[PDB]
Nucleic acid binder design. Structure first.
Lengths: 83, 74, 82, 86, 97, 79, 74
RNA sequence: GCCGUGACGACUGAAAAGUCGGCAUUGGCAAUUUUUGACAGUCUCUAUGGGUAACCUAAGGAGACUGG
């Protein structure tokens, strides 16, 4: 199991931002993160490629179709500075 | 038929005239010499049909599996 | 057989690599690993439709490689022995 | 042999190129098998990577912060600057 | 495994290495590589010799008004390594002859 | 709970005519009667057709083996 | 490993499915496997025109699933 | 680099089996979430750019279409 994956699981319960492979941007609370990067989130704000926003209560995005995630800076400190 | 699977179908079609469509829209008609586990494909006396029209007569040809959309007997 | 093993032997050679995204990379191989992830030094890299940039070091994810252009001098028959 | 080629650049500031052609510059803190990357104090650039462009060096820069990038979408990395001491 | 390289579709590559014969490789980059197979593997990675690379291009609106006419191009590459994912098709022929 | 593979096994048994959505190609879809299939979702289709959504034109294929790579979606059609 | 997607929470709920190709459908989750292939019942294609057409019970390959959104509360 | 396999050993379980440490190598690693590609190609819009006007240009940024 990968070091970044452990840090992702650490962000469960925090507000995170997710960009898909298609560039839609989803911001809200990370409920569950699976090993393969599958992501369950809640109370989302989505910002499309045209710039428009929307609001969603509940979402789930497949890991493969995620380009990246932004996590809090609350995580940066520890414990993974060992590596 | 009583369940006719991918693998046997293709094996029945070896020794036969086939045409393969690729994802990219090219088409290749020829005698299917063989296929392998990953579904890579070997044609003889291959012909190329692009826009459904005879383009090039090519001979013996390997097609990488990931390129294949579908295969037809013909 | 496993041709990545062959590439792993090419440390300290200078090569030109063409990428899947069209980019052209000329530099000296410091390391190829099992995933064909390639590392170089003294690199002149030309993204398609730019003038070159020079980098002291560059690390390529293996899958993004189209092909390597090898030194004409390279003694392939030696390198193909295991 | 050594496995070091990634571990060497760890803690350093790194310029990472994405498959769409974006430029992510952050502090390289972690990686893995897939090359999923952990980038601290990370910004995104689109238009240029400056080599002292007399007009300006920075257009379409965005502050992101703590970034996890998936390796699928990574193309390449070069050393941008030394580690911040902190 | 050798049996599958020997008799399966990859026998095209196996036959080209043994006979030192030419093959044309249609390639994902819309380019074609014409040459001899020094080595190959499962993925169709190859080490190639005497490669003639051929492709086609356009001036791409040299006028400034979207006017160009197609242009063929080629170039010689003595020694090179091809990552096999870029393979579309590999052709064996009376080419070497 | 219905498992997706089983749905297919159902399609197979029923000999329902099937329409397949292909990957990253919207202007064409494929149709046919699933005779068999494998672990990779590769399908053997009978009396198959290319369906051009733009041209309203159908191309007749007969015996088809479609690689599963292309499968986006599987639906049934009354025809 | 060979993990399940954590989707039991979404079972028998109405969902909005974003697929590749800019394609969107809506329906009730009836099941899934480790590849994230889905069974969706009472499915409706939301055509880019805005028009919606009923396609019944269908299989969506997990490969081509970008995103799903619940239209219910879980 | 990743993961198996065979014994030996240790610790649990009613059992079925499960867990851990070291050793060994006769094993594999292109089939949906990463590394053996679904990518490839085309066109329109925009000056914060130049130009005396007429206007020309499109890096960057935005959109459309083809793959019969």
């Amino acid at each position: 199991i990968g070091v970044p994956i452990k840090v992702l699981h650490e962000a469960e319960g925090h507000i995170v931002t997710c960009e898909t492979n298609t560039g839609e941007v989803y911001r809200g609370k990370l409920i569950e993160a699976e090993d393969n990067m599958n992501c369950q989130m809640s109370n989302i704000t989505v910002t499309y490629r045209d710039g428009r926003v929307a609001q969603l209560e509940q979402v789930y995005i497949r890991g493969s179709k995620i380009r990246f995630l932004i996590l809090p800076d609350m995580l940066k400190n520890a414990p993974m500075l060992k590596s | 038929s009583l369940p006719l699977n991918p693998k046997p179908f293709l094996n029945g079609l070896t020794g036969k005239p086939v045409m393969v469509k690729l994802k990219w829209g090219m088409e290749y008609k020829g005698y299917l010499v063989s296929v392998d586990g990953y579904m890579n494909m070997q044609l003889a006396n291959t012909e190329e049909y692009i826009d459904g029209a005879l383009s090039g007569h090519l001979g013996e040809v390997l097609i990488r599996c990931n390129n294949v959309l579908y295969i037809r007997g013909v | 057989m496993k041709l990545v093993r062959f590439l792993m032997k090419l440390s300290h050679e200078t090569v030109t690599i063409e990428l899947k995204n069209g980019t052209q990379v000329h530099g000296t191989i410091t390391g190829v690993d099992v995933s064909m992830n390639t590392h170089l030094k003294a690199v002149k890299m030309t993204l398609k439709n730019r003038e070159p940039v020079q980098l002291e070091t560059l690390s390529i994810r293996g899958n993004n490689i189209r092909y390597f252009i090898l030194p004409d001098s390279l003694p392939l028959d030696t390198l193909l022995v295991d | 042999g050594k496995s070091s080629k990634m571990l060497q650049h760890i803690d350093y500031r790194m310029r990472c190129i994405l498959q769409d052609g974006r430029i992510f510059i952050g502090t390289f803190k972690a990686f893995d098998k897939h090359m999923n990357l952990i980038l601290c104090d990370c910004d995104e650039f689109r238009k240029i990577k400056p080599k002292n462009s007399k007009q300006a060096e920075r257009e379409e820069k965005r502050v992101l912060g703590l970034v996890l990038l998936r390796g699928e979408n990574l193309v390449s990395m070069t050393v941008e600057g030394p580690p911040p001491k902190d | 495994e050798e049996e599958e390289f020997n008799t399966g579709p990859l026998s095209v590559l196996t036959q080209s290495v043994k006979n030192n014969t030419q093959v044309l490789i249609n390639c994902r980059n819309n380019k074609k590589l014409l040459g001899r197979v020094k080595a190959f593997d499962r993925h169709c990675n190859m080490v190639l010799e005497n490669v003639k690379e051929m492709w086609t291009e356009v001036p791409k609106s040299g006028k400034g008004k979207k006017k160009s006419k197609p242009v063929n191009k080629d170039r010689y590459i003595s020694k090179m390594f091809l990552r096999g994912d870029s393979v579309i098709v590999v052709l064996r022929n009376p080419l070497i002859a | 709970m219905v498992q997706p593979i089983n749905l297919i096994f159902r399609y197979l048994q029923n000999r329902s005519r099937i329409q397949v959505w292909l990957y990253e190609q919207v202007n064409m879809r494929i149709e046919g009667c699933i005779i068999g299939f494998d672990e990779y979702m590769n399908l053997v289709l009978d009396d198959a057709e290319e369906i051009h959504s733009k041209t309203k034109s159908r191309k007749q294929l007969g015996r088809i083996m479609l690689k599963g790579d292309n499968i986006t979606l599987l639906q049934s059609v009354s025809n | 490993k060979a993990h399940p997607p954590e989707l039991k929470k979404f079972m028998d709920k109405k969902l909005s499915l974003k697929l590749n190709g800019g394609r969107h459908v809506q329906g009730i989750l009836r099941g899934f496997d480790p590849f994230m292939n889905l069974v969706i019942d009472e499915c409706v294609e939301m055509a880019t025109s805005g028009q919606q057409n009923n396609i019944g019970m269908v299989v969506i390959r997990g490969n081509s699933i970008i995103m799903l959104e619940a239209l219910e509360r879980v």
